[PDB]
Design a protein around this ligand. Sequence first.
Ligand SMILES: [Zn+2]
Ligand SMILES: [Zn+2]
Lengths: 633, 264, 194
Amino acid sequence: AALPSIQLPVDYNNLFNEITDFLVTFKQDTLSGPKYMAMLQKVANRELNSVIIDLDDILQYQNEKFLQGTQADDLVSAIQQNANHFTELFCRAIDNNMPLPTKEIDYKDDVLDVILNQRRLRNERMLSDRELFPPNLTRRYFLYFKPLSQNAISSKPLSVRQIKGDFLGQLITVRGIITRVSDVKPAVEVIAYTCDQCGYEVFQEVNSRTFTPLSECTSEECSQNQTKGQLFMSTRASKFSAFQECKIQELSQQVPVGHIPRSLNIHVNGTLVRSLSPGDIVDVTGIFLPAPYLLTETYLEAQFVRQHKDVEERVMELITSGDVYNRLAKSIAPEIYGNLDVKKALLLLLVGGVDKRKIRGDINVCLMGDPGVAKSQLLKAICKISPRGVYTTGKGSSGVGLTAAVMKDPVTDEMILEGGALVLADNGICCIDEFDKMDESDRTAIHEVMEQQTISISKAGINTTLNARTSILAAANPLYGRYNPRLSPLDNINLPAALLSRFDILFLMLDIPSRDDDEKLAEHVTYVHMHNKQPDLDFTPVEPSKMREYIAYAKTKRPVMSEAVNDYVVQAYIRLRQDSKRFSFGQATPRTLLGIIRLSQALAKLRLADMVDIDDVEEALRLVRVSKESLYQ
Amino acid sequence: KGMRELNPNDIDKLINLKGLVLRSTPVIPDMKVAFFKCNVCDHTMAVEIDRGVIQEPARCERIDCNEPNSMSLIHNRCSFADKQVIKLQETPDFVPDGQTPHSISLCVYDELVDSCRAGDRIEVTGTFRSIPIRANSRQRVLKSLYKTYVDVVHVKKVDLAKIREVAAREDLYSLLARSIAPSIYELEDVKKGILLQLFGGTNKTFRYRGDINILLCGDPSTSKSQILQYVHKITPRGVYTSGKGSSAVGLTAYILVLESGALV
Amino acid sequence: LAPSIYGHDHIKKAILLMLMGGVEKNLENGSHLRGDINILMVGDPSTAKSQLLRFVLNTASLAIATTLTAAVTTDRETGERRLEAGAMVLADRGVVCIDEFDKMTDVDRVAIHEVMEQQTVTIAKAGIHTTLNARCSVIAAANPVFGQYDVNRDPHQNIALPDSLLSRFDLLFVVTDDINEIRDRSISEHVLRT
Ligand SMILES: [Zn+2]
Ligand SMILES: [Zn+2]
């Protein structure tokens, strides 16, 4: 099959010379050996494998040469135009110029050194008249081009649907959301075959999605002896590279009206693997390339990535200022009016009690009563403030759900077991909005959190319990739109009193129309709308990231029992039992006593003490007393 | 080291993975020796399989016969090892929780077959391995990215003298009763009844069974649920669930195949 | 707006306030409170509702016609799953027009709360756990699920939509086919000329 040919305005000999000149000369001299040769000494020490080339370095080198009065033939345009070939040129230049190691390596421990040394010895035995390898085999590093900064096409972040066929071969940059990521798998750069009948190994480089394996020994050792020896693949000696695929999709906002969102395959190789995860919003530089399916399949060979997204001294800045529990509680959602006792309890759920051996240490609160009053925003704010938090609703989060299951990926054919929200909330806190509406499986799921700190599986031959140690924050908004504000909650709420008895505290709150409290609430709301800042004075609202310092710091200040608290909490239980000597389900029980103990331990954590304080017990009892008096309405 | 962290350097090394068994194949026969019988002279010879390749004899071994292409494979006189493949999942405990757990296939051999079952959390120690896979079984053509698996060499999950010494004690009824749940209030009639439930009776095949069945009534505001939790931990092969909204088929067995419910 | 429509001055005024809707409030720590306005026209069929939605749709800009939220989706040829935008995501800082809103299914209505409270929608499967901007001002319309509309019963009672959903809208109109002879004479002669 004969081919025609044409002359073109390029020369890879001249550009190879330019590339090695750049490599052996350039440094970032505006910041005042060469950057690239020093980096290649790091490669030679086996301390580095990711060789990054900046197009800005190439541009600075071109400008330096042009300033010195010689044309650099705009290597930036060439690499932005036919990027894939210049990977080969850059790697050949490196292989022709990389300096020897400085740090010791124990060089014989690499199989490639032993096998190529043996081939060299055999070739010297031949060479006494009695390439050595394909270079990709010996090439340990991975080479990537990094785009131009703003100052050019590689710099511009294209949406996926702007990637047209004319860009094929160019080092473009794309922008979107990763909708799927592959597990890592190895791919052969060079296959190494042993030869059974002579021991002289032979090599095949692979440069496509498929190949055909070798059979007969092509080496002169066999071929000259006309000895038709058989070849066997060795994974020990074959060079593999890490491979991974990711599907990028344009952002949902970029989709024109009525169009389907367009998507693309990104292939990533070498050390750059597992730089991406699903749900990431990211800019990725790569070579936009065809693949064998006249319509070609197409993908992006990734090259560079831009994701869109001490303390133990710094906590002292808030500790030294004092009254930090009261202030931090007042910092919980300062845009929400009042209810400071509720906020003070919700903080203790993040701080937590003691678990011991078992003794169960999580702390749980239920909000109950009329809808609105910024409650859903408070639960969302808790999910924002708290570390290891998650927000749900009794019917929401309706994908993987709050309740766990065995599952397929029905878009493909494999099966997997995966956890629901209660497992993500493990070692943390789960917020249940619309708590009144959750079903029997959901209710038994939160039962299993409270009764085993797990969620169970009994399906498709798999019996397993997944770990779910987590605090519950919950919102039981009533039936029929409004509570009847003189009745027991069970005349207003769907949920069984059995479930409610497991919570450490319950706050019934009613949306009472009352001119005076209406005006106090309305003054707060209107002031927040008017002033745009400081939702109240003297609250000292701490910002989320700064208070996470103290929440994490407080969480680890585990207490030890004091005999004073042991007596005092026994007395506190007996005092509340006198009130229990009866008109609602807020009775004193061992679980309320445990709630007081855990709330007290969380207060001991917050006051940074080892000895738990009778003050902690009395304040824990105060929150329980306010809770019961709230429940009594 | 984590399943997510394996990389091309490991590909011939020995590794050790913690994980959850999702499921296993049946036992798969793997030919270790082929058996070749001569169509002409009925002479027989044995060939060890080398790297999955049958080293077929091209001519009959006996020099007094030596006919070419006369040997044929007598399948059920070949000798076979046992192989089994198991799907081992990254545990949901160790994942970065926003995205799925991985899983890896492992090959397990000979008497190590059926050493574990679905739902077992295990360690497996083995060589990491990789193999190519064909683009079409009618062709030698291979896909560039290899399949990977671990080829296991060891597995692990997750006396009477002492018993006789305790058996002579006089407080033994209360001693065993306290031990079931010393963290809960002592309620020792409940704990003694549960202790008898843990002992059980005897059986007779001629129907009756040596079971014991208990119902904890009383208020919802008491510790009985925690007692149940400890007893579920104590028993070798129990289950825990609850009865509100519990279906007659969900509790028992459900629908193609029928799968066992909690009670079964 | 809608000069062919008899009466309904207050409805048209409320529509204009939604088209000129309120200003966003990002408080300290970037704490977000929603400025956009949401409206729902309950009532009989054959009333001005759907025609008002036509006039709004052709008057507004960045306006999406529906008759929602966001989803993870798949189709015949795709061996892959893609994240899709509903009308509120498409109407981010725009408007949505929702006729026959009483017909919307449960998985939609459960997630409408995120639009109404947080002006956003959250994704929770296939590992795409993320949240999208859906910061629109909505106008919706709905019909009785059985019979003519009973003006004694609540919208929660004439239509299957929960009160805990209906209450999200800033303004909640109930319109009805008044049997006024002057109106009937006018619209009749218009239909006859048509
Ligand atoms: Zn050979
Ligand atoms: Zn023979």
